């Protein structure tokens, strides 16, 4: 009844402490949906895109520790918008296990500093809206301190953005997501 993709920022601007906090966040969300019919998929992005597991992969082995523990940081630039496009066009597709009539949810974890992306958010966000894709944004690092990165989290998040933008250290993201599903 819900298909949840994580899209995690692994650029070199994410320090190692923050990247581990992304893995722990992801893991805690998956553990909490364990007694439910939720399916998960994850992609890491920088200037390249690695699909760590598809919805089909999770179907066959729904172990958060099996899939999330070996994830290693990619480094490189930050192509968040192209990352969003590749999620809606490939990971939310039945070939990768996505169920029609499930609620589509994308959780983008980033420091809010897109760099090196030939796509702007205006090229990918309206398309994600036209697919059924509800977007949550989890900010790490300095994201909430600068006006540009704050704007970036607002631009990604579905609306009202205050029910979709959260910080990685709190449980508020997972509390809102549980309550909405």
């Amino acid at each position: 009844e819900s298909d949840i993709v994580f899209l995690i920022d692994g650029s070199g601007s994410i320090n190692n402490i923050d990247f581990q906090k992304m893995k722990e966040f992801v893991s805690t969300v998956m553990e909490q949906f364990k007694k439910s019919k939720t399916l998960f998929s994850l992609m890491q992005y920088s200037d390249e895109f690695r699909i760590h597991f598809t919805f089909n992969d999770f179907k066959r082995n729904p172990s958060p520790r099996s899939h999330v523990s070996p994830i290693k940081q990619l480094n490189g630039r930050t192509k968040t918008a192209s990352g969003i496009r590749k999620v809606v066009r490939e990971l939310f597709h039945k070939t990768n296990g996505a169920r029609e009539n499930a609620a589509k949810i994308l959780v983008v974890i980033t420091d809010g500093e897109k760099f090196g992306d030939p796509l702007d958010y205006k090229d990918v966000i309206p398309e994600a809206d036209r697919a059924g894709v509800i977007r949550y944004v989890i900010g790490v690092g300095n994201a909430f301190n600068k006006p540009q990165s704050r704007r970036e989290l607002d631009t990604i998040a579905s609306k009202p953005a205050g029910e979709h933008v959260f910080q990685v250290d709190n449980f508020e993201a997972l509390n809102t997501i549980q309550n909405q599903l």
Partner: nanobody
Amino acid sequence: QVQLVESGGGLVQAGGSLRLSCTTSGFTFDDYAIGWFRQAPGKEREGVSCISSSEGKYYSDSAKGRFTISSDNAKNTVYLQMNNLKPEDTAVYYCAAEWNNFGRLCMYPDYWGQGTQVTVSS
């Protein structure tokens, strides 16, 4: 019950300075980060500043270097000291409160005051 009451607005010349006050009541003060926002008619809204006991202070690009936000925790009041004011800073200034455990530095306030007018003339 919940109140966020701006004062200290009014007319000042360019180069001048004003101190806004946001006196609050009706909620536990320490549970909220408090910020200032502004809007003139015909102009886009802007965040200005925010203060949180856990996340520190935040300033917009226009505010940074000129403006100082502070909190009198005993009186549940937040001040915005605004120096080097300009005619382009003419706007209705609102204070706002956002639940601090979100950790967002006032990005999406839960409560808003009525706003008070600030006019900057040459």
